[PDB]
Symmetry: C3
Subunit: 175 residues, 3 copies
């Protein structure tokens, strides 16, 4: 199965959904889904001594402006390997601009992680969590001479709305 096209989004979508992990928490390797083959590829090694603050990936059968599936940061107890998928719930939305282009990130938790599965909204997290996440996106491409503007975090409902828009766009795209 191709992890973008062939993996279902999950019965609970847009609220609860499968996430295919591309990058493990703690990684300095920016892996990404290769859209054509469905394999995981090295996009680059990060240009700064920074690491992903959480497991990171995309939602199957979704589609955004940048012509990729929608991006998700998944907060949980443990690192998850690239190419594996998990079930997550959206708890917040982080709007950002990358080189003048819209690139929002979904903040999620894994609903099968007994520590984090009860979380419904980013306001419940230690405020520091959010601070670190924001800083990561402001920093991670700085040494590439690329500009990344991150805006104020938004509530779980803003993220569910984004996930829905992305499901609709994928559906129109499939022909």
């Amino acid at each position: 199965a191709h992890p973008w096209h062939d993996l279902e989004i999950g019965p609970g979508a847009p609220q609860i959904f499968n996430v295919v992990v591309e990058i493990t928490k703690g990684s300095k390797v920016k892996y990404e889904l290769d859209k054509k083959t469905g394999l995981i590829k090295v996009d680059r090694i990060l240009y700064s001594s920074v690491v992903y603050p959480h497991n990171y990936g995309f939602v199957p059968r979704t589609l955004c402006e940048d012509n990729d599936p929608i991006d998700v940061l998944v907060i949980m107890q443990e690192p998850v390997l690239p190419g594996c998928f998990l079930r997550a719930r959206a708890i917040g939305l982080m709007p950002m601009i990358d080189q003048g282009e819209k690139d929002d990130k979904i903040i999620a938790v894994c609903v099968d992680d007994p520590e984090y599965k009860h979380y419904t909204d980013i306001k419940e997290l230690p405020p520091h969590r959010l601070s670190e996440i924001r800083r990561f996106f402001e920093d991670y491409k700085k040494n590439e001479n690329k500009e990344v503007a991150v805006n104020d975090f938004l509530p779980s409902e803003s993220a569910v709305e984004a996930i829905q828009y992305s499901m609709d766009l994928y559906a129109e795209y499939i022909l």
Copy 2:
């Protein structure tokens, strides 16, 4: 190739067989094969501070009561990544009951691991190995309020018999 259906069991089956690893030795992540897609998914993060004592997975083209392929714990020098497969020999059988349902585990070694490949039966292992394995299955779901009864370990021939029954059942299932 789908790792359950498309990977051969191996010429030496039931004695020697391919094992597709789902969980790496030392992991607190309970990954499993997603039957529909053939991808590896996060079933859950374990509810206790316990880790898998050995690499863990399933045998291709086999089928048991729980409608999964037969489970295998593979004892060897090194951790093996989820989604990769290896060649193993069955050396013992661990019968257990999980929530009133039969769920036996095969104890195996990797025949391509120069340290362990000579082993033919679990009686050769340090007795502690077996003690730890048993305890792991008695403990690992305890914090989920689920009951796991493990019985006395059985010899290599009992495991080969189980593997055979599971090959037969898979064959009847494929239609």
Copy 3:
């Protein structure tokens, strides 16, 4: 997609090419591509207390004497997981004989690794790098009672030529 047949070699071939990683830097597990299924398998655990000095893999849609795709060692800042691919440039060739049979290795860098991407030829590397690599291949099968002769390293152009010969051979093979 099957990582040998279905992944493109890359527009820049023979100079720049996709590499599918089989073994991570630091590993004592000799994983290899299973040609039939496209899955990653444990060929063996190394018989010595040695580890791969760099990420290691093969080039898609190529073919050599041993009927495998051409082998590549990729020098970079970070470990890369088996089954993922990256873009590399060939910077040198290491000729060797394994049990009386030709088995040359390509020395490459990852062109998406900001530290190493500028390298064009092995003469630029610390001489020790090359010394360690050579020794690894002379040592890694010694405890299997197998003989491995490694010869003097050769320049980037010798490696590009090898990659080209291997692309031609693959093309003739596909029927």
